[PDB]
């Protein structure tokens, strides 16, 4: 990486910065709110 972030092939004696170790994303999930909003479909399907 010090051959890659410096854009050369021969480097000299020293200390260089390349990148960091931030944690990369793996997945995409979702948690929304409770519903408590059921339609009145009991009489729609279970009327006598």
């Amino acid at each position: 990486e010090t051959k890659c972030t410096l854009k050369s092939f021969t480097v000299e004696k020293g200390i260089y910065q390349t990148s960091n170790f931030r944690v990369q994303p793996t997945e995409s999930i979702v948690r929304f709110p409770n519903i408590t909003n059921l339609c009145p479909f009991d009489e729609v399907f279970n009327a006598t």
Binding site: Q17, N20, R22, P25
Partner: protein, 49 residues
């Protein structure tokens, strides 16, 4: 660190930054020029012996 400040650790913004190119290497080769003079300022003020 450049990508981190400009882009919030994402992927779509990290790829787009390369289109601008070397706007940032110029930035971290200046704040590494400053951050080596500070180690040089103290070495010539206190370390004469």
């Amino acid at each position: 660190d450049c990508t981190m400040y400009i882009c919030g650790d994402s992927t779509e913004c990290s790829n787009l930054l390369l289109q601008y190119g070397s706007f940032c290497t110029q930035l971290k080769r200046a704040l590494t020029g400053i951050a080596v003079e500070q180690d040089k300022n103290t070495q010539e003020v206190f370390a004469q012996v």
